[PDB]
Amino acid sequence: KVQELSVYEINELDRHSPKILKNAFSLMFGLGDLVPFTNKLYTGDLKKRVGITAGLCVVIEHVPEKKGERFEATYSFYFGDYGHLSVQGPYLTYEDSFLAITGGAGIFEGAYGQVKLQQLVYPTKLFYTFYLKGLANDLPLELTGTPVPPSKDIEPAPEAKALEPSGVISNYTN
Amino acid sequence: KVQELSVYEINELDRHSPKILKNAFSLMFGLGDLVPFTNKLYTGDLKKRVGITAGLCVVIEHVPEKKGERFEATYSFYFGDYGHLSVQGPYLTYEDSFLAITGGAGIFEGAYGQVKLQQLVYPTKLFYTFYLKGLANDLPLELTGTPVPPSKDIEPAPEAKALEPSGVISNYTN
Amino acid sequence: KVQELSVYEINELDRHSPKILKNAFSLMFGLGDLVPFTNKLYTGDLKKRVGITAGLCVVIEHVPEKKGERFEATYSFYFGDYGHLSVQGPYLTYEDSFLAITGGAGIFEGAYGQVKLQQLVYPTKLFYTFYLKGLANDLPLELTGTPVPPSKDIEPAPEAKALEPSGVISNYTN
């Protein structure tokens, strides 16, 4: 059975990310550049903060015909006390992509499948669709609220940005 | 059911790859050294260019008794519109190894298993064999032709290096 | 079914590890800092040397309240001829956590599940409890001896520190 889970990842310019480690001999990103990162994570209904993403983007090549970059990513999605999701695959700054679910822990132990990566605003808003298989349980009501249709002007609920209890999960990751 | 898939990885020196981020205080490779890389990927029968490899090699330690290096490599294999497989494991410059497949996306969504890595020319020609498990369907007939005899002399079909229609899969990754 | 497999990762400091790539804005650890690493691995009963751990620790943030760091880790455990296991998990130097099992090779082909990481002595002794699913068979007996309850004063048996035959598996990884 497939449980579709969607979140919103936003860089609110407060976690020192992304951090650029420059090695390519070019004013544009190129192989050599490494970009560690860590942004916040809010539920798909934008009412709650669940955790953060954490990981590493490796630059593969700038794509000028597409006015964009090519990173190879391996990173996690943290959902507080519930557990986390890990992924591996392509992140194209210019289009939408699909990454592999390499596994999970917690309520996400044994997770597999693919996850959709939709950009919205570069480099601050991305929407994801986890076509999640492998879990032993139905997901938490607080993580499955009807998603908010993605667009450039989406904003987490004021309470979630404000970290008020109603807008967060227990031990939300920060 | 286990499906077997074999491709050839070739460094044709046109992707600026690999990049050596030398950090170990030796002329030899050692821990601290990181190598982002991306080579070309061709079908096992070498008839069609399907895509590239892309990711990172982490130097673990040089191996004196073997005239070689032990890397811990995390990267993916991109097959154009078909999708991709992610992987994690040991790359030994002096011997063949098996790297674990961590997941896939597209026709490889749900993939799991292991892959053998054979180095034909260090480090410009490589030959793998995935033992793919988990695929919902049978592999595209165009991906599973008899391969070419592993050797330091292998070369892609002319139509494939030339990127002619009959030498490439649709939207082969680049 | 789950096949619990515990192991000890002893850092005896003879592998130039942890190498520290210090790039963060801050003096203490922070995003940007990278720590490639490799330690020794022993069986749960500390009677045998099986091989090594190899991979990368990416710093996500310093956690001052906890006088410790948050890392996002992607590494592999090597068990000689039995193969290896790979992972993606949060490493928090100040508290136990769980890692996703991204896969395995050799006898570990098909591996999935989660692993509990318990640090016993920072940064030297660590203890893992892998709730290991998917394997084809029961694990070989050499790897399933009764594990030693964790403690900050544990040390591997003598036979193994010395790499004597009765203390190592065949072709243990180094």
Side-chain angles (χ1 to χ4, degrees), chain A residues 15-16 76 78 86 106 109, chain C residues 31 61 72 88 90 114 133:
Chain A
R15 291 171 64 64
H16 302 277
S76 301
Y78 288 96
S86 289
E109 173 281 324
Chain C
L31 187 74
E61 60 207 31
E72 173 66 29
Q88 180 75 6
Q114 71 178 318
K133 309 178 176 181

Side-chain angles (χ1 to χ4, degrees), chain A residues 15-152:
Chain A
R15 291 171 64 64
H16 302 277
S17 177
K19 174 56 174 176
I20 296 173
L21 300 179
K22 182 69 187 185
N23 294 285
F25 304 132
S26 179
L27 293 158
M28 287 176 211
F29 277 116
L31 186 77
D33 299 338
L34 300 173
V35 182
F37 63 91
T38 183
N39 306 307
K40 303 164 192 182
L41 217 46
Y42 292 97
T43 51
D45 61 22
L46 288 163
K47 297 186 181 177
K48 296 189 178 65
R49 176 68 172 277
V50 303
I52 64 190
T53 48
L56 179 59
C57 276
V58 176
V59 174
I60 292 305
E61 57 189 36
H62 178 65
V63 189
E65 67 263 29
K66 300 272 193 159
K67 302 271 265 79
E69 315 306 359
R70 172 175 273 278
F71 299 92
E72 174 61 24
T74 310
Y75 61 116
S76 301
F77 291 76
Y78 288 96
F79 293 84
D81 290 324
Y82 295 124
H84 81 270
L85 281 172
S86 289
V87 302
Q88 188 166 350
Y91 163 45
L92 299 182
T93 70
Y94 58 85
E95 66 187 25
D96 300 342
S97 72
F98 291 101
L99 298 92
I101 295 179
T102 57
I107 65 172
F108 302 108
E109 173 281 324
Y112 64 105
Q114 78 186 319
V115 40
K116 185 175 185 179
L117 185 163
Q118 288 182 68
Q119 243 208 21
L120 300 72
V121 181
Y122 187 79
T124 50
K125 299 174 188 175
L126 277 65
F127 183 69
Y128 291 90
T129 317
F130 285 95
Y131 299 104
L132 308 156
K133 301 165 180 174
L135 276 55
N137 279 135
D138 298 335
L139 291 162
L141 307 183
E142 52 191 64
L143 299 184
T144 71
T146 299
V148 165
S151 86
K152 74 185 173 67

Side-chain angles (χ1 to χ4, degrees), chain B residues 147-165:
Chain B
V148 170
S151 83
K152 78 176 256 187
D153 296 322
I154 56 89
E155 302 290 341
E159 293 84 13
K161 185 185 168 62
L163 304 178
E164 295 185 60

Side-chain angles (χ1 to χ4, degrees), chain C residues 3 12 20 26 52 54 71 76 100 114 117 125 136 143 156 164:
Chain C
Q3 298 188 69
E12 301 153 39
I20 303 185
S26 62
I52 64 175
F71 293 90
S76 291
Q114 71 178 318
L117 178 175
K125 300 174 202 158
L143 302 179
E164 290 289 326

